[PDB]
A = this chain, B = another copy of it.
Amino acid sequence: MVVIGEKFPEVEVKTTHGVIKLPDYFAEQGKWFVLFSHPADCTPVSTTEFYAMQKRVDQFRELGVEPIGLSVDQVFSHIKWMEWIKENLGEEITFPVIADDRGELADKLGMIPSGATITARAVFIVDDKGIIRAIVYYPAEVGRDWDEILRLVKALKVSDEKGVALPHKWPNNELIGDKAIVPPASTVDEVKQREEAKAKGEIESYDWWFSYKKL
């Protein structure tokens, strides 16, 4: 019961890093946060996701995006589980993990499938304004791909710094490559695009179909 572009509910949650409020603990220091949920149905796949997210927690943090886990568990079970991951899989877990009980956040963030209080492997990208910028709902049985979520958060970043729209499989589109397209003029072209085209920058056009930055 949330959509893209809606404010994250600014709620109080107990994590393995204190008790925080979400678009305060991250939005205040101008941080995005990738809030990824977990069912308690499948928790060997959750383990692989936690091993992978820590395996690539630098890439998220270099981007200025804070990973933050979530599940309907208690904190003590999570710290014990993450210590198991450190012991068996040789990997710390450095990001916080929310512990919502009775699934209040998942009810107010729409992560509860109907007929089962948890079946969704949900990911929310929330920007430094607190805007829910992208949602993913994998099934419990299929572990996600954090390379894809890395690509999505890189694309959300680039579209924010450079105001562009990011093609399919950017930056490995088969037609284009890594070139991000400037959103087409919703008014007369001259307002920005003719001023800023290859006459006055690297906002070069692509056969008059669009303007790309390659940036």
Nearest residue in B to A120 (C-beta to C-beta)? Answer: B4
Nearest residue in B to A155 (C-beta to C-beta)? Answer: B142
Among B140, B167, B184, the residue within 8 A (CB) of A83 is B184
Copies of this protein in the assembly total: 9
Among B86, B101, B146, B164, the residue within 8 A (CB) of A72 is B101
Q: A117 CA to B102 CA in the complex, in Å?
A: 6
Nearest residue in B to A14 (C-beta to C-beta)? Answer: B186
| Inter-chain contacts of A176 with B (CB < 8 A) | 44, 48
Q: A166 CA to B143 CA in the complex, in Å?
A: 5
Given contacts A45-B165, A174-B52, whether A159 and B143 have CB atoms under 8 Å apart is no
| Inter-chain contacts of A110 with B (CB < 8 A) | 1, 3, 110
Q: A37 CA to B166 CA in the complex, in Å?
A: 16
Given contacts A18-B189, A79-B185, A186-B76, whether A1 and B1 have CB atoms under 8 Å apart is yes
Contact B184 A79 (CB under 8 A): yes
Contact B3 A111 (CB under 8 A): yes
Q: A41 CA to B22 CA in the complex, in Å?
A: 21
Given contacts A3-B137, A75-B187, A209-B44, whether A143 and B168 have CB atoms under 8 Å apart is yes
Contact A184 B44 (CB under 8 A): yes
Q: A190 CA to B120 CA in the complex, in Å?
A: 23
Which listed segment binds B: A26-34, A57-65, A128-136? A128-136
- A interface residue numbers (CB < 8 A to B): 1-7, 14-18, 39-45, 47-49, 51-53, 55, 72-77, 79-84, 86-89, 99, 101-104, 110-120, 132-148, 151-152, 155-156, 159, 164-170, 173-176, 181, 183-191, 206-212
14 contacts between A and B (CB under 8 A): A1-B3, A3-B110, A3-B137, A4-B114, A5-B120, A17-B188, A42-B184, A45-B167, A74-B186, A76-B186, A80-B208, A83-B189, A84-B208, A144-B169
